[PDB]
Amino acid sequence: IGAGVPYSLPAATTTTLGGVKKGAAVTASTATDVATAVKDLNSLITVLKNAGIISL
Amino acid sequence: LQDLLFSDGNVKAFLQATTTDENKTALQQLLVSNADVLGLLSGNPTSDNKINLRTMIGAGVPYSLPAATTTTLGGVKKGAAVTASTATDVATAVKDLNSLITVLKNAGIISL
Amino acid sequence: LQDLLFSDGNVKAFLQATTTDENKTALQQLLVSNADVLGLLSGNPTSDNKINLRTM
């Protein structure tokens, strides 16, 4: 009958297409020095790591 | 005696407990009125029968997860690991931002 | 002669090769015991039949 099995959405891996969770909110950067700019970049990285969008 | 008692040849084959595929098609038609179910009983439903049989039982087709596009929801691959930034100058901070961008590009999370 | 030989009216309609939808429902019941499959053979399975047919 051309039917499929019950589909379960797998988590993304480095080799295989999958779902992700949406990352937490991240504030736009108003940094005027390097230290703060780096702080803001790192906040984005952690958010993407927390949501399993990028690897640890 | 069955020949003297019954006119229908498909019924007669059933009563002899020996039916051909043609007899079976005719006997199915005496037993079931829904055309899509008759398609199923044949073992060879048409394309239309298949669609209608799935509708009949509320079944879906085999699902294949498509890649995300700019217009359509889809799956992604998970991005490679990215190190937290310890940059103390602009050059390094920019280096770290770009590393994140490439990782997201590599995983098809953002467009080239 | 079929009237003299058989009591069941749904069987008699089958033997005459002329069945109504009601005769077909009864004949299906003589042939198949699973309630969800009987739902399928009707062409109009209930919500419960549909769930059970997919499981099946």
Residue numbers in the entry:
A (entry chain 1u): 226 to 281
B (entry chain 1h): 170 to 281
C (entry chain 2t): 170 to 225
Sentences from the paper on this structure:
Both 5ʹ ends of the genome are covalently connected to the terminal protein gene product 3 (gp3). ϕ29 infects the Gram-positive Bacillus subtilis cells by injecting the genome–gp3 complex into the host-cell cytoplasm using a short non-contractile tail, leaving the genome emptied virion on the cell surface. Here, we report the cryo-electron microscopy (cryo-EM) structural studies of the ϕ29 prohead, the mature and the genome-emptied virions at near-atomic resolutions up to 3.2 Å. Our results show structural details of the complex capsid, the DNA packaging motor and the entire tail machinery, and provide a molecular basis for understanding the assembly, maturation and infection mechanisms of the bacteriophage ϕ29.
We calculated the cryo-electron microscopy (cryoEM) reconstructions of the ϕ29 prohead, the mature head and the genome emptied head to a resolution of 3.6, 3.2, and 3.2 Å, respectively. The complete mature and the genome-emptied virion models each consist of 235 copies of the major capsid protein gp8, 165 copies of the minor capsid protein gp8.5, 12 copies each of the connector protein gp10 and the tail protein gp11, 36 copies of the tail appendage protein gp12* and 6 copies of the tail knob protein gp9. Structural comparisons of the heads showed overall small differences between the heads (an average r.m.s.d of 0.7 Å). Structural comparisons of the mature and the genome-emptied heads showed that the equatorial part of the genome-emptied head expanded slightly after the ejection of the genome. However, the icosahedral end caps shrink upon the release of the inner pressure, showing the elasticity of the capsid.
